[PDB]
Amino acid sequence: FRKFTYRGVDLDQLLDMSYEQLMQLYSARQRRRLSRGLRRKQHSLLKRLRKAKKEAPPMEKPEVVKTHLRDMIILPEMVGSMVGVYNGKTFNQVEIKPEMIGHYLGEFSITYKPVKHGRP
Amino acid sequence: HRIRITLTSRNVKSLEKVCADLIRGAKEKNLKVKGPVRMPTKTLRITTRKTPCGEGSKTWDRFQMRIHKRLIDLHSPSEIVKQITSISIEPGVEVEVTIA
Amino acid sequence: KSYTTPKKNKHKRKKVKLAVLKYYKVDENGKISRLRRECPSDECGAGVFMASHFDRHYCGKCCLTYCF
Amino acid sequence: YKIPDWFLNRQKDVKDGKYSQVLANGLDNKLREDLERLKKIRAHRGLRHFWGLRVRGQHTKTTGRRGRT
Amino acid sequence: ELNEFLTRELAEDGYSGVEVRVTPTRTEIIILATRTQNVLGEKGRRIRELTAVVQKRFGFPEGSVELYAEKVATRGLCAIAQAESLRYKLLGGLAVRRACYGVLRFIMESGA
Amino acid sequence: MLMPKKNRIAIYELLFKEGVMVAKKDVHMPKHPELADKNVPNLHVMKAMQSLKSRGYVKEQFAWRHFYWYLTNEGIQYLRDYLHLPPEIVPATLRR
Amino acid sequence: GHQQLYWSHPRKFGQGSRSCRVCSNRHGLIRKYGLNMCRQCFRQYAKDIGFIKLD
RNA sequence: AGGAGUGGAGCCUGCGGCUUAAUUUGACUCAACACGGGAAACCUCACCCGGCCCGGACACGGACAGGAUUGACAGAUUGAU
RNA sequence: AGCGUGUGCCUACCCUACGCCGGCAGGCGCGGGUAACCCGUUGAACCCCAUUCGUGAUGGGGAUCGGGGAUUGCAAUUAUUC
Ligand SMILES: [Zn+2]
């Protein structure tokens, strides 16, 4: 019920707002990620991924797409969907919160299970 | 007018005897020449393990060249310098010439 | 050998025999006519034809699809 | 009062983005809400903090015996 | 690389050693073996063949090298030639003891 | 094994004038060094002249990271039969 | 397709951009002075180059 | 006779054990344990989860210019134009 | 102070002085060196001199942890590094 705000800007005026000031508003790691030229020489996977996220279903539960790339920088244009992610064996079917922005997709996909110790 | 003759090799005795050959030729041609000057010999140190596997006492081997370098200055025209560097060639030494 | 995963084959070329009949047509006289268009690219040949699908087509060496 | 912006312990906050220099109760409350934010967001660092292990990703096979018995 | 190439090549001609002589516009090298009539080939075909081999392989301009062939004197005093001769004797199915006695007798007859 | 027909003829005619070619042992780097005037691969050349070795026209021995090859009388006879040239011309391998 | 699937990983750096010039291996390389070869092939072919033991 | 220490505290690294789709393996007193020049994010890679290409030369018997295969754009597909 | 190192066959990754911007790590032009020539008289550390501290887990020790800023790379999340 509380109006959550990310870095002092609200959801609408971070949604319709341009990439270079978005890069300015991001931290130091995401600045170098987006400020090193066009994302076409190697990031064609990321290109096809966020355009497949850009195409949108009608008013129901969102479509599921699966990713083999855990190094995705969360953008405002692709927030609020339903994405499964590969961890190495299976697919982690996870939901995108509005607070994903500024993180990586591999951080929310746990790879190693917690261990338990019995008799050595 | 100022031609510079650079001599480099690995064996020292062959290098000093061909330097003696050059200085004796320059003496018998009766022209002003300067004797050889000795740079420090740069060592070529590479240290590596002995055994192929990872078993045994930690033993190391040390290998070296001895690159001896000398150069002389000739106050002489270029044609006699060309014929001297054309004659008396041996595989022990390497002859390098330059002019500026 | 026969594993758990089933075997899936590639694009097998079906034996479409007498395809030369689809190249040209014969009228009453010795004149000729075609039902396939001509690719005007320099990388395409003067006699190289272009494919025939329900909406668009496909070239040979050119691989250009002219769409409206 | 003429203090540079980079000389602060908290820059570009997640809620307002202003440059704040927190105090003892302020830093304690902010660390508590940050820990509960990672626990609610269910990230890897939040799971490591909930389990009570190292979060910076180093070796703990040989060290770290002071955590429990 | 040249020594490894010639040891891989002349396994039957009894290769002994090679030397490289530096000279401007003439990269002169001289081969040495226990027999000189077999390293040339038929009317000197193999020698210019390997000359073309090294000129094409080592990136030198054509006509830079000119390979000669010299028979080594006192062949029993070279360890490479005696080892290759003993390898040839062992490759024929001969016993090791008779071949070893023969090569050691030849070595002491050479004057070692 | 889908070599274009110009490539095998090009290999054969460069083999005719000088009866040896060298190849770096690498199936990854495609561009031949001294065939710089045309687009010629390396693994196709390697497999084709390995098939020539399997037939027995050439003799092949190995090195550090390189290959060497030979042309015999039967090899140059097969090359002249394939290229359809009269025997009045002689390769430089069998000439002074 | 296959021609760009074969060339996907660049070889501008890393250990895979170089190998031994004799045994073709990627362990224990000597990048000093353009040897570009492993230490044990170097031990096998040391004294022929001129690497002789004085120290 | 001594000097510096280690073993005690924290940290780095290796091994054993436990766990794991997999936590790849050699080396267990001197004469293994910052050893394989082994400071592994991708190649390394030898381990696992997934799909492509042949990188099956050459002989024998079938197939063949009327045709033996590779090279793909429209919409579903993993992971990828 | 002394061993050394420094622009490469596949290759494209070298050493850096000088002049500005910035606390900082870093950024652009400016030039040399295929090397006793240029970095470089390699103004290194320890040590010396003068204040502050005063037996207190203390200004010792810096493990653990939060945020921000830079370079490398095609990509650093399981903090690459600073
Ligand atoms: Zn066309």
Side-chain angles (χ1 to χ4, degrees), chain A residues 108-120:
Chain A
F108 312 101
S109 65
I110 173 168
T111 298
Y112 57 95
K113 64 183 293 184
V115 301
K116 193 46 173 268
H117 309 293
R119 210 46 172 166

Side-chain angles (χ1 to χ4, degrees), chain C residues 39-41 43-44 49-50 59-64 66:
Chain C
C39 179
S41 299
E43 55 187 358
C44 292
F49 282 128
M50 184 177 177
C59 282
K61 306 107 180 166
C62 318
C63 297
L64 282 72
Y66 309 116

Side-chain angles (χ1 to χ4, degrees), chain B residues 39 84 99:
Chain B
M39 283 73 74
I84 294 169
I99 187 166

